[PDB]
Design a protein around this ligand. Sequence first.
Ligand SMILES: [Zn+2]
Length: 44
Amino acid sequence: GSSGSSGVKPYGCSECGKAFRSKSYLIIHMRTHTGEKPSGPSSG
Ligand SMILES: [Zn+2]
């Protein structure tokens, strides 16, 4: 038995699959998806 945290947030982008404690953070990020070059560091 060891530390077992769930860690959840009201926001979780689907395109890449990230999260942002705050909404603003998400939007600012979406920019990448919306605009060209949506998939960057998201390799696998
Ligand atoms: Zn994303």
